[PDB]
UniProtKB/Swiss-Prot annotation, chain C:
Gene Ontology molecular function: rRNA binding; structural constituent of ribosome
Highest taxon above the source species: Eukaryota
Protein name: Large ribosomal subunit protein uL6
UniProt xrefs under SUPFAM superfamilies: Ribosomal protein L6
Summary of subunit composition and partner proteins: Component of the large ribosomal subunit.
Organism encoding this protein: Oryctolagus cuniculus (Rabbit)
Length: 52, 176, 190, 199
RNA sequence: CCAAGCGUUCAUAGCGACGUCGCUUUUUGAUCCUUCGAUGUCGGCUCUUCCUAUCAUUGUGAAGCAGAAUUCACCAAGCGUUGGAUUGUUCACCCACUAAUAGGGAACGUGAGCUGGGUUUAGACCGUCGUGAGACAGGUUAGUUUUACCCUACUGAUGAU
RNA sequence: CGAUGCCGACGCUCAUCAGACCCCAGAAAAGGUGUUGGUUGAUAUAGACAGCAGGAUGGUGGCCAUGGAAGUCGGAAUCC
């Protein structure tokens, strides 16, 4: 179906991010503040839910 | 108060009034910074009234003189202990400056609390000024000048007197 | 607080030859010649050292924001020294679950056609940046190899042929298909 | 008897505020090359600023309400008209002295043109602040003759470079005649030297 | 906004008690400032433009997003948001289609534009009240809807400099 | 639009909704690793903060309370 190491790439880009609970931005994994000016660079982030 | 012009550095002493009980009261020296002696005696009474149970009427000013500088030709490092109010609360501070005179550094401290913290000349309360040795300073904006072979260029010399040649042929130069 | 001086120093190797017309650093070496005008930074670039062993950047009286532009420059010049002496090789793989991503290189590398991405009938054609040579490699089932001197061009053409192949209106957590940059490296080793 | 101001490198409101006073002082001013003028503040900000001007039209008959000139010359003229009493016969007479142009038309292409160092961008604008060219901004807000003025400008710079070379030549000749003649102008030079004209 | 709980688990996918901070003037009030030598007072029909607090469509971010369907959010008001049974209705309700059948403003847009069903003169009927004349945001039925040729605006038509 | 066309002083501030002067004609709670200044408290050549390994177990799968929860669903415990 797919190889696990080629799955780590696609998950590194499509699934392994952080989301801003205030503006739904898509921030890199090691993010503390959102980068969008529309939320105030809020520090209220969460992990991008893993698919099941 | 209003930090007009350059502040002078005044030395005001003053005592309560003689009475039958206290045949002679203790004198009280203060170290005021104000535009002129008329404002210096009024800040002397502001302070003495905020410390001792003593008012302008119940007392007297024994001496109000200006204290000059002991070395106005040596660049010094003054450290000041502020005490001021913001829109919400009141805070103590400690700020450092490089200047030649103490009253100079205090004028620069009033213009600095005005610039950075928008604190009017009447909220501020200088409580201690002290000439500090260059190896006791803390602010990196003032430690950076403690170099013996200091060297830097003036890199963007913006043209002033823009209106004397107001209409000119050649364009201005900024490298010098 | 304005800082008096803030400076760095890139160390040029004896193999490279570098010169600068003001803030226009041109770097010539074994693989080509790269020029990057820095006229928007307001620093002083000095080509000090006899035979030019090093390049020294200076910012006089710079606030915190302008002190950032120092290491940025010293890192772009070292990415030109690197992309002129070694090169930039952006090895990248193709990930597909069912429909194989049939990629093909035209125009001697300056164009890439991607067919059958997610079983679609639209043939994505991607014009490469001028200086970036893509080529299907060997020893790896499905991957491309991008090659060039300028990292901004190689990395941007890789971002172009990565963003071209994106899933739309689906669940990008389950539909993990695309052409992703796997390895960043150099043409010849060191 | 006339001011020829090169609009390149100048700030919009500062140039206007300075022209609108000489013009009111009965002085004939000609602002040339009105697409070199650059406003302060990042481009997209100045775009949104002029697009908002475009959005102000008369709701019942737009053929009457604010006229939005799309050329840089007429945008400068329009912004000088804000610094004049253009509703009185001394502000209409004022405006009748201003004469704005895009590029350098051939009445003023062969003319030394002045500069206003009280309004330049290098003088009036910190180097780390962005700005917007009035030419580019007019092109992206509905100016059509940018690609024509560009060629008609390069076709002029190529023609002036010849004059400047034929003039550096007429100054090398003169700088070497001031050496072939130095023997017999030796008495007329010291008199120009003891009075600071030739030192 | 905070976050006790809901959500198999898990405060913040989506919600949210206890509190608390604001926005609007398309709800009703409060006030009585202008108008009583009169500003024609409900709806509907027709017609234009504008708002965005987005139902649909374009481009996107997030899910308890496998797909399909569907929720939350963003840039966004360009372009759409219908045909009918009942009621004077506004509102409401149902049928049918649809991509969707979003909410609104403009003197609660619009009577020298119409209509005049309702409201709201004088005629009469019924009920309750009053000894009575008479009363009833209680029902019923019949009941005159005037003028532009002026100035502007707009639409077209001559011409003027 | 009369008067700074001073070589005025010192700083703060970038706004893809900037800001701009009693009454006054428009905003709050709550936020920001935007930037600037302060306060208190730590550790740093007995070598820090980052950055690239191992190892987190014996008792113990602790007792507890449950259909069972074993360093992880609850609670007092919380010692070698
Ligand atoms: Mg779907
Ligand atoms: Mg729960
Ligand atoms: Mg009237
Ligand atoms: Mg009337
Ligand atoms: Mg009327
Ligand atoms: Mg919106
Ligand atoms: Mg009405
Ligand atoms: Mg009417
Ligand atoms: Mg009527
Ligand atoms: Mg009727
Ligand atoms: Mg009746
Ligand atoms: Zn965010």
């Amino acid at each position: 179906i797919i190889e696990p190491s080629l799955r780590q790439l696609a998950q590194k880009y499509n699934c392994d991010k952080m989301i801003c609970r205030k503006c739904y931005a898509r921030l890199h994994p090691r993010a503390v503040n959102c980068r969008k000016k529309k939320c105030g660079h809020t520090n209220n982030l969460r992990p991008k839910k893993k698919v099941k | 108060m209003k930090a007009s012009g350059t502040l002078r550095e005044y030395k005001v002493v003053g005592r309560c009034l003689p009475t039958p009980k206290c045949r002679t009261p203790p004198l009280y020296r203060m170290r005021i910074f104000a535009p002129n002696h008329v404002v210096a005696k009024s800040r002397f009474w502001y302070f003495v009234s905020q410390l001792k149970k003593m008012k302008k009427s119940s007392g007297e000013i024994v001496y109000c003189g200006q204290v000059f500088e002991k070395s106005p030709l040596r660049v010094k490092n003054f450290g000041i202990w502020l005490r001021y109010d913001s829109r919400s609360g009141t805070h103590n501070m400690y700020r450092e400056y490089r200047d030649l005179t103490t009253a100079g550094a205090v004028t620069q401290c009033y213009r600095d609390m005005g610039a950075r913290h928008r604190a009017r000349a009447h909220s501020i309360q200088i409580m201690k000024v002290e000439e500090i040795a260059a190896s006791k300073c803390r602010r990196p904006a003032v430690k950076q000048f403690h170099d013996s072979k200091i060297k830097f260029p003036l890199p963007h010399r913006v043209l002033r007197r823009q209106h004397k040649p107001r209409f000119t042929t050649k364009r201005p130069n900024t490298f010098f | 607080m304005k800082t008096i001086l803030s400076n760095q120093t890139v160390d040029i190797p004896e193999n490279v030859d570098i010169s600068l017309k003001g803030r226009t650093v041109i770097v010539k070496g074994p693989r080509g010649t790269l020029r990057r005008d820095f006229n928007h930074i307001n620093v002083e670039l000095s080509l000090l050292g006899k035979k030019k062993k090093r390049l020294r950047v200076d910012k006089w009286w710079g606030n915190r924001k302008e002190l950032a532009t120092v290491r940025t420059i010293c890192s772009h010049v070292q990415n030109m020294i690197k992309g002129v002496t070694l090169g930039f090789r952006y090895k990248m793989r193709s990930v597909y679950a069912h429909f194989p991503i049939n990629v093909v290189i035209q125009e001697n590398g300056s164009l890439v056609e991607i067919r059958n991405f997610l079983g679609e009938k639209y043939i994505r054609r991607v014009r490469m940046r001028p200086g970036v040579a893509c080529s299907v490699s060997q020893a790896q089932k499905d991957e491309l190899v991008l090659e060039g001197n300028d990292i901004e061009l190689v990395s941007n053409s890789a971002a172009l042929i990565q963003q071209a192949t994106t899933v739309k209106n689906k669940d990008i957590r389950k539909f993990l298909d695309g052409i992703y940059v796997s390895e960043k490296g150099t043409v010849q080793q060191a | 008897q006339v001011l020829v101001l090169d609009g390149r490198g100048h700030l919009l409101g500062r140039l206007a505020a300075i022209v609108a006073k000489q013009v009111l002082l009965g002085r004939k001013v000609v602002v040339v090359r009105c697409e070199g003028i650059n406003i302060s503040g990042n481009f997209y900000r100045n775009k949104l600023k002029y697009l908002a001007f475009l959005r102000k039209r008369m709701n019942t008959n737009p053929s009457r309400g604010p006229y939005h000139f799309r050329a840089p010359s007429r945008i400068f003229w329009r912004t000088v008209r804000g610094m004049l009493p253009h509703k009185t016969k001394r502000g209409q007479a004022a405006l009748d002295r201003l004469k704005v142009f895009d590029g350098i038309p051939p009445p003023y292409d062969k003319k030394k043109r002045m500069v206003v160092p009280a309004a330049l961008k290098v003088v009036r604008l910190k180097p780390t602040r962005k700005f917007a060219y009035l030419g580019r901004l007019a092109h992206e807000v509905g100016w059509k003759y940018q690609a024509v003025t560009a060629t008609l400008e390069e076709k002029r710079k190529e023609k002036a470079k010849i004059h400047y070379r034929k003039k550096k030549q007429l100054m090398r000749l003169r700088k070497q005649a001031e050496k072939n003649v130095e023997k017999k102008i030796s008495k007329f030079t010291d008199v120009l030297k003891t009075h600071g004209l030739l030192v």
